[PDB]
Design a protein around this ligand. Structure first.
Ligand SMILES: [Fe+3]
Ligand SMILES: [Fe+3]
Ligand SMILES: [Zn+2]
Length: 296
């Protein structure tokens, strides 16, 4: 079972710390940002501490790890050229970092059209990806399914297919399927997950899903709000998320929790991943999970 979470990529230990943390939570894979998720500031490849990170991954049975690009990348931005240019430059550097880390995919939010409209934004993403994937290398960009909050592009499989169709080196594209995002966009992942996969197979191809993000939602189907919830405590629920986690279509695809920390206040937030993974491995919902996460 290839199941883990977002983990830290910080401090002196960098990737070694990621691997230690993933093992702490009983993971077999994990996802990192290559630095702060909120910016493009990054340490040198040497300071990512990759050789030691790989040694700890080998010791603890961690494989198939994932990189996520910072959430501030917006290569759909048609009216702020410094933002577009920074996104292109950053992603070229991220591909080099990711090759060194040994992840197959960089998860990328396609972007936000910020009032220029979907057509202009998709054309801009295509332009940016054509700049980024010009260089040869096998790391893929995994376009994330998005909730459709604000001016996000990627709320439908059709929007993702338009980007894939426009990019020249489109073999270097994959998809990251996020259960919260697809639910919030309106896909019936709770009660018709196989129907959602069949729609995905028609439009894109399920073989292109190279990362799965496993998140419940604080909102009902179609709400377009993108507020993650702990596994089984939201509007998708345990049975549906457990079904997705164990689904044969995803057997050799890393599954990554991005669920919220639990705490009595923001100074006491604790990670839920260890207990969520235990629950998913047992295939039995634990109503006490939030109470127990706070007690860790
Ligand atoms: Fe994301
Ligand atoms: Fe996600
Ligand atoms: Zn989200």
């Amino acid at each position: 079972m290839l199941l883990g979470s977002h983990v830290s990529m910080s401090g002196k230990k960098m990737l070694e710390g990621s691997a230690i943390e993933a093992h702490e939570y009983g993971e077999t894979t994990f996802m990192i940002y290559t630095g702060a998720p909120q910016n493009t500031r990054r340490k040198s490849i040497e300071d990512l501490n990759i050789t030691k990170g790989h040694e700890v991954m080998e010791k603890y049975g961690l494989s198939n790890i994932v990189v996520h690009a910072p959430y501030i990348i917006n290569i759909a931005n048609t009216t702020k050229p410094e933002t577009f240019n920074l996104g292109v430059d950053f992603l070229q550097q991220e591909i080099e970092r990711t090759q060194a880390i040994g992840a197959k995919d960089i998860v990328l939010h396609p972007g936000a059209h910020v009032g220029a409209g979907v057509d202009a934004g998709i054309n801009k993403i295509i332009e940016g990806l054509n700049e980024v994937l010009t260089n040869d290398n096998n790391v893929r960009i995994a376009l994330e399914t998005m909730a459709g909050k604000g001016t996000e592009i990627g709320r439908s499989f059709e929007e993702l297919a338009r980007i894939i169709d426009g990019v020249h080196n489109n073999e270097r594209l994959s998809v990251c399927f996020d259960t919260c995002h697809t639910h919030d966009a309106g896909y019936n992942v709770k009660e018709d997950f196989d129907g959602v996969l069949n729609e995905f197979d028609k439009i894109i191809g399920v073989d292109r899903i190279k990362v799965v993000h496993v998140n419940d939602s604080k909102n009902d189907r179609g709400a377009q709000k993108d507020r993650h919830e702990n596994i089984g405590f939201g509007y998708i629920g345990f049975d549906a998320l457990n079904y997705i986690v164990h689904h044969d279509s995803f057997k050799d695809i890393p599954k990554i929790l991005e669920t919220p920390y639990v705490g009595e206040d923001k100074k006491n937030k604790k990670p839920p991943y260890k207990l969520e993974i235990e629950m998913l491995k047992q295939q039995h919902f634990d109503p006490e999970l939030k109470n127990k996460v706070m007690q860790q």
